Design an enzyme around this catalytic site. Structure first.
Site, PDB file in Angstrom:
ATOM      1  N   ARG A 147       2.371   4.387  11.010  1.00 39.70           N
ATOM      2  CA  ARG A 147       2.762   3.826   9.760  1.00 39.70           C
ATOM      3  C   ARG A 147       1.555   3.071   9.176  1.00 39.70           C
ATOM      4  O   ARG A 147       1.095   2.082   9.752  1.00 39.70           O
ATOM      5  CB  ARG A 147       3.953   2.864   9.907  1.00 39.70           C
ATOM      6  CG  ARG A 147       4.384   2.182   8.603  1.00 39.70           C
ATOM      7  CD  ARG A 147       5.474   1.123   8.974  1.00 39.70           C
ATOM      8  NE  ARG A 147       6.045   0.510   7.770  1.00 39.70           N
ATOM      9  CZ  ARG A 147       6.116  -0.779   7.560  1.00 39.70           C
ATOM     10  NH1 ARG A 147       5.721  -1.655   8.519  1.00 39.70           N
ATOM     11  NH2 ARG A 147       6.716  -1.214   6.457  1.00 39.70           N
TER      12      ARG A 147
ATOM     13  N   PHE B 210      -2.227  -3.600   3.181  1.00 37.08           N
ATOM     14  CA  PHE B 210      -1.207  -4.400   3.903  1.00 37.08           C
ATOM     15  C   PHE B 210      -1.560  -4.337   5.391  1.00 37.08           C
ATOM     16  O   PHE B 210      -2.150  -5.319   5.900  1.00 37.08           O
ATOM     17  CB  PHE B 210       0.195  -3.803   3.586  1.00 37.08           C
ATOM     18  CG  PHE B 210       1.332  -4.428   4.420  1.00 37.08           C
ATOM     19  CD1 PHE B 210       1.184  -5.752   4.949  1.00 37.08           C
ATOM     20  CD2 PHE B 210       2.569  -3.709   4.623  1.00 37.08           C
ATOM     21  CE1 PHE B 210       2.263  -6.322   5.734  1.00 37.08           C
ATOM     22  CE2 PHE B 210       3.626  -4.289   5.390  1.00 37.08           C
ATOM     23  CZ  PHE B 210       3.450  -5.575   5.922  1.00 37.08           C
TER      24      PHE B 210
ATOM     25  N   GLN C 246      -0.027   0.206  11.547  1.00 39.43           N
ATOM     26  CA  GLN C 246       0.916  -0.156  12.600  1.00 39.43           C
ATOM     27  C   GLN C 246       0.947   0.969  13.598  1.00 39.43           C
ATOM     28  O   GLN C 246       0.927   2.160  13.239  1.00 39.43           O
ATOM     29  CB  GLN C 246       2.299  -0.358  11.979  1.00 39.43           C
ATOM     30  CG  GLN C 246       3.447  -0.616  13.094  1.00 39.43           C
ATOM     31  CD  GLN C 246       4.737  -1.078  12.411  1.00 39.43           C
ATOM     32  OE1 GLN C 246       4.707  -1.507  11.255  1.00 39.43           O
ATOM     33  NE2 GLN C 246       5.889  -0.998  13.152  1.00 39.43           N
TER      34      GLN C 246
ATOM     35  N   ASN D  41       8.432  -6.584  14.989  1.00 43.57           N
ATOM     36  CA  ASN D  41       9.618  -6.864  15.834  1.00 43.57           C
ATOM     37  C   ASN D  41      10.856  -6.523  15.005  1.00 43.57           C
ATOM     38  O   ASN D  41      10.748  -6.045  13.841  1.00 43.57           O
ATOM     39  CB  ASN D  41       9.614  -8.384  16.244  1.00 43.57           C
ATOM     40  CG  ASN D  41       9.606  -9.315  15.035  1.00 43.57           C
ATOM     41  OD1 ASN D  41      10.456  -9.204  14.125  1.00 43.57           O
ATOM     42  ND2 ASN D  41       8.615 -10.252  14.982  1.00 43.57           N
TER      43      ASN D  41
ATOM     44  N   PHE E 278       0.615  -4.460  14.624  1.00 36.89           N
ATOM     45  CA  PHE E 278      -0.100  -3.971  13.443  1.00 36.89           C
ATOM     46  C   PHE E 278      -1.421  -4.765  13.324  1.00 36.89           C
ATOM     47  O   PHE E 278      -1.563  -5.856  13.945  1.00 36.89           O
ATOM     48  CB  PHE E 278       0.775  -4.100  12.160  1.00 36.89           C
ATOM     49  CG  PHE E 278       1.342  -5.480  11.917  1.00 36.89           C
ATOM     50  CD1 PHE E 278       0.744  -6.345  11.023  1.00 36.89           C
ATOM     51  CD2 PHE E 278       2.543  -5.887  12.532  1.00 36.89           C
ATOM     52  CE1 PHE E 278       1.310  -7.608  10.770  1.00 36.89           C
ATOM     53  CE2 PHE E 278       3.101  -7.138  12.339  1.00 36.89           C
ATOM     54  CZ  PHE E 278       2.512  -8.028  11.478  1.00 36.89           C
TER      55      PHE E 278
ATOM     56  N   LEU F 100       4.011 -13.514   6.567  1.00 35.25           N
ATOM     57  CA  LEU F 100       4.499 -13.166   7.913  1.00 35.25           C
ATOM     58  C   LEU F 100       4.447 -14.376   8.890  1.00 35.25           C
ATOM     59  O   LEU F 100       4.908 -14.248  10.053  1.00 35.25           O
ATOM     60  CB  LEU F 100       3.607 -12.031   8.531  1.00 35.25           C
ATOM     61  CG  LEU F 100       3.741 -10.682   7.692  1.00 35.25           C
ATOM     62  CD1 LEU F 100       2.751  -9.674   8.229  1.00 35.25           C
ATOM     63  CD2 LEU F 100       5.241 -10.227   7.730  1.00 35.25           C
TER      64      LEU F 100
ATOM     65  N   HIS G 224       6.009 -13.364  12.966  1.00 37.25           N
ATOM     66  CA  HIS G 224       5.363 -12.392  13.808  1.00 37.25           C
ATOM     67  C   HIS G 224       4.305 -13.154  14.570  1.00 37.25           C
ATOM     68  O   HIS G 224       3.582 -13.957  13.999  1.00 37.25           O
ATOM     69  CB  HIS G 224       4.704 -11.306  12.890  1.00 37.25           C
ATOM     70  CG  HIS G 224       5.755 -10.519  12.156  1.00 37.25           C
ATOM     71  ND1 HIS G 224       6.307  -9.379  12.679  1.00 37.25           N
ATOM     72  CD2 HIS G 224       6.452 -10.795  11.036  1.00 37.25           C
ATOM     73  CE1 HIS G 224       7.273  -8.937  11.879  1.00 37.25           C
ATOM     74  NE2 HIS G 224       7.393  -9.796  10.885  1.00 37.25           N
TER      75      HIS G 224
END
Ligand SMILES: [K+]
Ligand code: NA
Ligand code: NA
Ligand code: NA
Ligand code: NA
Length: 162
Positions: free
Chosen positions: A53, A58, A61, A100, A111, A120, A124
């Site tokens: 992904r 951004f 991942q 998660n 990621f 985030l 995370h």
């Protein structure tokens, strides 16, 4: 404890190496899990898995080494392990952070940020940073798309510690 490397191919062509320094002093169990999954043989960790992904501007991942699509993976502790702390923040590109499914559900998916992602923070766990191969991170990010489905297969062809 030593730094971790991934050798990367894009569309089955060598794209170079990313090396990460992990923050063992701050998140030792999160660092330990990512390092042992990198050292493990293919099928038991990151070696032979993909960045499934990838979303430009951004993050990239990866870490789903059982299903290759975001539904799988497992930590060395079992399916889920706790958020150790949120002392480190997503302050810069090139940070490693765990994906998660809510509090205390870390597995093997992680990621690498490519921008500041401070929204985030506190959700995370950040546990390491890229120290070589931000060029390679760039090249992987360039095959991302709006949907996150990569336009070329990105593989970890080898991983371990250096
Ligand atoms: K390995
Ligand atoms: Na590839
Ligand atoms: Na591995
Ligand atoms: Na993956
Ligand atoms: Na570099």
């Amino acid at each position: 404890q030593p730094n971790v490397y991934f050798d990367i191919s894009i569309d089955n062509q060598n794209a170079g190496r990313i090396v990460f320094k992990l923050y063992d002093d701050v998140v030792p169990l999160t660092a330990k899990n990512f390092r042992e999954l990198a050292k493990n043989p293919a099928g038991q960790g990151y070696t032979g898995s993909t960045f499934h992904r990838i979303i430009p501007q951004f993050m990239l991942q990866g870490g789903d080494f059982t299903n290759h699509n975001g539904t799988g993976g497992r930590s060395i502790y079992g399916n889920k392990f706790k958020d150790e702390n949120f002392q480190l923040k997503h302050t810069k590109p090139g940070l490693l952070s765990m994906a998660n499914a809510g509090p205390h559900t870390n597995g093997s998916q992680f990621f690498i940020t490519t921008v500041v992602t401070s929204w985030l923070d506190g959700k995370h766990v950040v546990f390491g940073e890229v120290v070589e191969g931000m060029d390679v991170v760039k090249k992987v990010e360039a095959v991302g798309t709006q949907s996150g489905k990569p336009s070329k297969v990105v593989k970890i062809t080898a991983s371990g510690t250096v």
